[PDB]
Design an enzyme around this catalytic site. Structure first.
Site, PDB file in Angstrom:
ATOM      1  N   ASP A 124       4.903   7.356 -15.047  1.00 47.04           N
ATOM      2  CA  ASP A 124       5.546   6.928 -13.797  1.00 47.04           C
ATOM      3  C   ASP A 124       6.340   5.636 -14.026  1.00 47.04           C
ATOM      4  O   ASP A 124       6.291   4.715 -13.216  1.00 47.04           O
ATOM      5  CB  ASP A 124       4.484   6.756 -12.687  1.00 47.04           C
ATOM      6  CG  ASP A 124       5.087   6.653 -11.274  1.00 47.04           C
ATOM      7  OD1 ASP A 124       6.200   7.166 -11.038  1.00 47.04           O
ATOM      8  OD2 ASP A 124       4.432   6.033 -10.399  1.00 47.04           O
ATOM      9  N   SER A 181       0.828  -1.180   0.000  1.00 42.95           N
ATOM     10  CA  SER A 181       0.000   0.000   0.000  1.00 42.95           C
ATOM     11  C   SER A 181       0.869   1.239   0.000  1.00 42.95           C
ATOM     12  O   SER A 181       2.019   1.199   0.408  1.00 42.95           O
ATOM     13  CB  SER A 181      -0.951   0.005   1.211  1.00 42.95           C
ATOM     14  OG  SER A 181      -0.261   0.277   2.418  1.00 42.95           O
ATOM     15  N   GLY A 182       0.303   2.339  -0.465  1.00 43.00           N
ATOM     16  CA  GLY A 182       0.997   3.622  -0.480  1.00 43.00           C
ATOM     17  C   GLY A 182       0.131   4.605  -1.237  1.00 43.00           C
ATOM     18  O   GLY A 182      -1.091   4.507  -1.196  1.00 43.00           O
ATOM     19  N   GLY A 183       0.760   5.529  -1.959  1.00 39.05           N
ATOM     20  CA  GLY A 183       0.028   6.536  -2.727  1.00 39.05           C
ATOM     21  C   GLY A 183      -0.957   5.952  -3.716  1.00 39.05           C
ATOM     22  O   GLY A 183      -1.977   6.565  -4.012  1.00 39.05           O
ATOM     23  N   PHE A 184      -0.649   4.765  -4.226  1.00 38.91           N
ATOM     24  CA  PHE A 184      -1.510   4.075  -5.189  1.00 38.91           C
ATOM     25  C   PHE A 184      -2.792   3.472  -4.596  1.00 38.91           C
ATOM     26  O   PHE A 184      -3.714   3.116  -5.346  1.00 38.91           O
ATOM     27  CB  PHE A 184      -0.725   2.962  -5.904  1.00 38.91           C
ATOM     28  CG  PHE A 184       0.014   2.025  -4.970  1.00 38.91           C
ATOM     29  CD1 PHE A 184      -0.625   0.922  -4.416  1.00 38.91           C
ATOM     30  CD2 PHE A 184       1.360   2.242  -4.661  1.00 38.91           C
ATOM     31  CE1 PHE A 184       0.052   0.058  -3.560  1.00 38.91           C
ATOM     32  CE2 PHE A 184       2.041   1.388  -3.806  1.00 38.91           C
ATOM     33  CZ  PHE A 184       1.384   0.288  -3.257  1.00 38.91           C
ATOM     34  N   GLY A 185      -2.843   3.319  -3.272  1.00 41.08           N
ATOM     35  CA  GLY A 185      -3.963   2.617  -2.626  1.00 41.08           C
ATOM     36  C   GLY A 185      -3.494   1.377  -1.879  1.00 41.08           C
ATOM     37  O   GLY A 185      -2.433   1.379  -1.288  1.00 41.08           O
ATOM     38  N   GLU A 197      -4.344  -9.011 -13.224  1.00 40.88           N
ATOM     39  CA  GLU A 197      -3.713 -10.314 -13.295  1.00 40.88           C
ATOM     40  C   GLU A 197      -2.527 -10.362 -12.330  1.00 40.88           C
ATOM     41  O   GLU A 197      -1.987  -9.324 -11.930  1.00 40.88           O
ATOM     42  CB  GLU A 197      -3.318 -10.653 -14.732  1.00 40.88           C
ATOM     43  CG  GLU A 197      -1.968 -10.148 -15.187  1.00 40.88           C
ATOM     44  CD  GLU A 197      -1.828 -10.197 -16.702  1.00 40.88           C
ATOM     45  OE1 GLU A 197      -1.300  -9.220 -17.271  1.00 40.88           O
ATOM     46  OE2 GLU A 197      -2.274 -11.189 -17.324  1.00 40.88           O
ATOM     47  N   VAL A 238      -3.170  -2.914  -2.322  1.00 42.37           N
ATOM     48  CA  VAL A 238      -3.259  -4.035  -3.250  1.00 42.37           C
ATOM     49  C   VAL A 238      -3.159  -5.359  -2.495  1.00 42.37           C
ATOM     50  O   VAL A 238      -2.198  -5.573  -1.757  1.00 42.37           O
ATOM     51  CB  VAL A 238      -2.140  -3.973  -4.319  1.00 42.37           C
ATOM     52  CG1 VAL A 238      -2.168  -5.215  -5.200  1.00 42.37           C
ATOM     53  CG2 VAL A 238      -2.282  -2.720  -5.163  1.00 42.37           C
TER      54      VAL A 238
HETATM   55  C1  LIG Z   1       2.375  -0.473  -7.316  1.00 40.09           C
HETATM   56  C2  LIG Z   1       0.922  -0.805  -7.129  1.00 40.09           C
HETATM   57  N1  LIG Z   1       0.117   0.093  -7.872  1.00 40.09           N
HETATM   58  C3  LIG Z   1      -0.649  -0.654  -8.813  1.00 40.09           C
HETATM   59  O1  LIG Z   1      -1.439  -0.178  -9.609  1.00 40.09           O
HETATM   60  C4  LIG Z   1      -0.298  -2.120  -8.628  1.00 40.09           C
HETATM   61  C5  LIG Z   1      -0.527  -3.439  -9.072  1.00 40.09           C
HETATM   62  C6  LIG Z   1       0.259  -4.279  -8.289  1.00 40.09           C
HETATM   63  C7  LIG Z   1       0.402  -5.671  -8.413  1.00 40.09           C
HETATM   64  C8  LIG Z   1      -0.350  -6.379  -9.349  1.00 40.09           C
HETATM   65  C9  LIG Z   1      -0.181  -7.751  -9.513  1.00 40.09           C
HETATM   66  C10 LIG Z   1       0.765  -8.446  -8.760  1.00 40.09           C
HETATM   67  C11 LIG Z   1       1.555  -7.744  -7.807  1.00 40.09           C
HETATM   68  C12 LIG Z   1       2.537  -8.424  -7.017  1.00 40.09           C
HETATM   69  O2  LIG Z   1       2.694  -9.622  -7.148  1.00 40.09           O
HETATM   70  N2  LIG Z   1       3.286  -7.733  -6.123  1.00 40.09           N
HETATM   71  C13 LIG Z   1       4.291  -8.419  -5.369  1.00 40.09           C
HETATM   72  C14 LIG Z   1       4.003  -9.018  -4.012  1.00 40.09           C
HETATM   73  C15 LIG Z   1       5.352  -9.114  -6.232  1.00 40.09           C
HETATM   74  C16 LIG Z   1       5.695  -7.830  -5.511  1.00 40.09           C
HETATM   75  C17 LIG Z   1       3.100  -6.403  -5.985  1.00 40.09           C
HETATM   76  N3  LIG Z   1       3.850  -5.644  -5.045  1.00 40.09           N
HETATM   77  C18 LIG Z   1       3.758  -4.245  -4.987  1.00 40.09           C
HETATM   78  C19 LIG Z   1       4.372  -3.418  -6.109  1.00 40.09           C
HETATM   79  C20 LIG Z   1       2.533  -3.688  -4.280  1.00 40.09           C
HETATM   80  C21 LIG Z   1       3.899  -3.643  -3.602  1.00 40.09           C
HETATM   81  N4  LIG Z   1       2.175  -5.748  -6.720  1.00 40.09           N
HETATM   82  C22 LIG Z   1       1.385  -6.398  -7.648  1.00 40.09           C
HETATM   83  N5  LIG Z   1       0.964  -3.493  -7.462  1.00 40.09           N
HETATM   84  C23 LIG Z   1       0.630  -2.197  -7.636  1.00 40.09           C
END
Ligand SMILES: C[C@H]1NC(=O)c2cc(-c3cccc4c(=O)n(C5(C)CC5)c(NC5(C)CC5)nc34)[nH]c21
Length: 273
Positions: free
Chosen positions: A135, A14-18, A89, A20
């Site tokens: 970004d 989580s962070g500025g993006f919301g 996905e 997940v």
């Molecule tokens: C960065 C954040 N903003 C988005 O729109 C989005 C989508 C994901 C996201 C989508 C699908 C899979 C993963 C994923 O497997 N991971 C992991 C656990 C592999 C790193 C992560 N980690 C993040 C970047 C959120 C911290 N995001 C996904 N993360 C974000």
């Protein structure tokens, strides 16, 4: 609608993006990611052809989710009273590029070439579909560790691609070009190429080249790791102070340093498995 179709797992981040979460589509056990964004924390809104007020990211992802690509696919989305929820996905096994670089330090050039080429293909795809990410950075790139395929994520700072000047910017500052820092003005493609220079430097040196505004403005690139002359040249070109001195995507991919790229599967076998 959401509760029944998807089984929610742990928070991925989580962070500025919301926020997940990991998740699974109940019907066929397809791995998914579930992104929640509060309506108050969204400033950039758009409209679907249907005529429905949605976050811009939804518009942008629908425009690029056509076909296969190095772009994270929007499978579904939902509106709630005070939030939007996006179903994305999820590759398995997966690691984001920031953590991958942190763990390895600087990447071997052969690996950086494969990764950078794939980012370029994904960004070209976005631009063909009329979408600007705004970004591009290692944190917004996921690596499919088995297949060696990169995927772009997070279009929450993005916009419709246009040929006129942009005067708004919500992306990451240290990846933002000098023209934004100095004039709060930039054009889409050439700002994107700046961020790609920062990304490439990040890959082969293990960190970004500039921290402060004054370093960005000065545009002097110092290499902290051993990097080939051809790779240094491409990086310096992408980071030209004048936007019009930066290469086009075609010029980047025809650069000598970009020749004989490995296929993603080869990349995984040699560098990831
Ligand atoms: C960065 C954040 N903003 C988005 O729109 C989005 C989508 C994901 C996201 C989508 C699908 C899979 C993963 C994923 O497997 N991971 C992991 C656990 C592999 C790193 C992560 N980690 C993040 C970047 C959120 C911290 N995001 C996904 N993360 C974000």
């Amino acid at each position: 609608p959401l509760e029944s179709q998807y089984q929610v797992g742990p928070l991925l981040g989580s962070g500025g993006f919301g926020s997940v979460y990991s998740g699974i589509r109940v019907s066929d056990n397809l791995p998914v990611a579930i992104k929640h964004v509060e309506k108050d924390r969204i400033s950039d809104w758009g409209e679907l052809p249907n005529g429905t007020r949605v976050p811009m990211e939804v518009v942008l992802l629908k425009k690029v989710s056509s076909g296969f690509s190095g772009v994270i696919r929007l499978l579904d989305w939902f509106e709630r009273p005070d939030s939007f929820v996006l179903i994305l996905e999820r590759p398995e096994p997966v690691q984001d590029l920031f953590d991958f670089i942190t763990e390895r330090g600087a990447l071997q050039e052969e690996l950086a070439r494969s990764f950078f080429w794939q980012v370029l293909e994904a960004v070209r795809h976005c631009h063909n579909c009329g979408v600007l990410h705004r970004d591009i950075k290692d944190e917004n790139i996921l690596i499919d560790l088995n297949r060696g395929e990169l995927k772009l994520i997070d279009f929450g700072s993005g916009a419709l691609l246009k040929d006129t000047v942009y005067t708004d910017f919500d992306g990451t500052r240290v990846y933002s070009p000098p023209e934004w820092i100095r004039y709060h003005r930039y054009h889409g493609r050439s700002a994107a190429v700046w961020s790609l220079g920062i990304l490439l430097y990040d890959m082969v040196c293990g960190d970004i080249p500039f921290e402060h505004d004054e370093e960005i403005i000065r545009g002097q690139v110092f290499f902290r790791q051993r990097v080939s002359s051809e790779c240094q040249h491409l990086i310096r070109w992408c980071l030209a102070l004048r936007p019009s001195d930066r290469p086009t995507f075609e010029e980047i991919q025809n650069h000598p340093w970009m020749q004989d790229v490995l296929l993603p599967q080869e990349t995984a076998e040699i560098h990831l498995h």
